[PDB]
Design a protein around this ligand. Structure first.
Ligand code: CO
Ligand code: CO
Ligand code: CO
Ligand code: CO
Lengths: 330, 330
């Protein structure tokens, strides 16, 4: 036990169907099989999607993950960032790797559709309708259901526009028990997000505040944790990428939190992109070190062994990688 | 003659092929057959595209236009707003109505893809590559070529990000002679846009600065016109829609400019949307008068007769509706 999920639950849904909490295994709570920044579709002429090569590439990464003992990936790709459940299902059915997809949108400057629905009507209820339908019935008539709601906020505040999504999410959460994972911008708003969602009636045991590794002051992480929610160092491997701290700094914070007993509330991920949508990313020369360990095998090969040699126990490692994911999503 | 297009020309391209300047006929220089605010795709579950109903609805509007003697529509829909040349081609082949589609993106807060390419590399050259390919070879391997480049800027300035597109556009323009139509936000930046593009080497005779009806001070229109470019009152029918002036005000300005002899530089359009992408628009109760005349038959039925009874001549009307479009796009 400890802090178990409240009332209203629905068996964890993956792109290939419902899976039991115990079948989840080691999990990466925040990754992107395919991803495109909003607008990517507008570059379809020179940046078309090569299905054959994306499939070949993604299943390969999937296989490398299974070999590491990772049995599940939570794909956090927002509805406006290329989210494609049917494709994810292909990858999963081809490899056996389990994948949960999300429902939600990126922050304010991403797109403009709902900012517009909001000027003309009740956008909260429209977002609520969409989230609930995708979480209980499916996405785009495919029958594939989202297994997490994804929320995002800006750096300086959770804007009134962003809050429409947080309330729609809170509602669906209370009604269905579906988990909620978030994006925080540049290490800010973690506590505000936690305060808001719990105040809205969302179960702190089904809430994971993301990109918390974006902040290096542990007092900041401790304040979020006070709310009873889990937090994720989900961008491990992306170092100094205009903003992000280094892994050295992330681990310093993690080991402090771990030695303070917060293991039941810490999750680990990379926030990697296996295949980019649109025109392949032009990576400058100086950016190389920053993205060097920014691939999904980094935690399994570098992070988990580094934590262990630091005194973190095998049980603490299993709690973060298997224990937490099973309660959060299962 | 007068101010005819410079060197480097390419026969006007429509979704169904090249058309001769003389085949253009009366034209609406800025309209949207289908349109979706960026992000619309993310609402695919409850706001899917009903092809059968969009086709039935759009050809109908097309037929009403042909009956008015309008033989061509310049669809100004940006690459990030649902632009779909294949669909436009269906509408055109089904009715005979001629349609030219565009190449380009909406302003800064619309999407984020190129803001990202810009942090990692040479976005100007990537936008240039895309624009040129779509204007000379085609869009998405369909062989359908864009017949206009579409540019947009914000209200307070033509941002450094927005200027990447203006330079890519200027380049393609000099190289291919393809026309350029713009969007101006809330009646500002008209002169700045005209100054910038001509300074970049773009032909003022193949440049139409849009949404100029958004400003009601004719001194503002006169300054843009000084640059030798044409300007369009292309949102006729959208009144008071949070910002926009009333048609009464637009016509007051138009008749002043007309009686000052600027007929060779004035174009008329509605900026209507025949079929919305995403969830159908929820139109409040107070918004009704604002969108009442916001449909493509408004100029033919209300505007052109109102101008005539005001003293505007049949020749001045033909110059705006046929003369200008033929030089600009043909
Ligand atoms: Co994120
Ligand atoms: Co992410
Ligand atoms: Co516009
Ligand atoms: Co428009």
């Amino acid at each position: 036990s400890g802090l178990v999920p409240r009332g209203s639950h629905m068996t964890a849904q993956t792109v290939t169907g419902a899976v039991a909490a115990a079948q989840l295994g080691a999990t990466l709570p925040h990754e992107h099989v395919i991803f495109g920044y909003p607008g990517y579709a507008g570059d379809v002429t020179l940046g078309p999607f090569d299905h054959a090569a994306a499939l070949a590439s993604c299943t390969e990464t999937a296989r490398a993950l299974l070999a590491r003992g990772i049995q599940t990936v939570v794909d956090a790709t927002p509805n406006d960032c290329g989210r494609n459940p049917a494709f994810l299902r292909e990858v999963s059915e081809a490899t056996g790797l389990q994948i949960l997809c999300a429902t939600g949108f990126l922050y304010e400057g991403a797109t403009t559709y709902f900012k517009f629905r909001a000027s003309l009507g009740d956008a909260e209820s429209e977002i609520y309708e969409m989230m609930r339908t995708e979480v209980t019935e499916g996405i785009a008539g495919t029958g594939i259901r989202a297994g997490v709601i994804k929320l995002a906020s800006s750096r300086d505040a959770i804007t009134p526009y962003e809050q429409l999504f947080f309330r729609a999410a809170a509602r669906v959460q209370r009604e269905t028990g579906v988990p909620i994972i978030t994006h925080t911008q540049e290490g800010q708003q973690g506590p505000q997000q936690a305060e808001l969602l719990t105040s809205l009636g969302a179960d702190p045991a089904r809430i994971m505040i993301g990109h918390m590794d974006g902040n290096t002051d542990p007092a900041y992480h401790r304040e979020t944790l006070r709310h009873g929610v889990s937090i994720a160092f989900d961008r491990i491997g992306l170092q100094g990428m205009v903003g992000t701290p280094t892994d050295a700094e992330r681990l310093s914070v993690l080991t402090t939190l771990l030695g303070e007993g917060y293991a039941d509330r810490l999750l680990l991920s990379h926030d990697s992109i296996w295949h980019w949508l649109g025109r392949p990313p032009a990576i400058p020369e100086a950016a190389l070190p920053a993205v060097k360990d920014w691939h999904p095998l980094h935690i399994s090969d570098d992070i988990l062994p580094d934590l262990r040699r630091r005194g973190i126990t095998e049980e603490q490692v299993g709690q973060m990688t298997v224990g937490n994911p099973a309660r959060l999503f299962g």
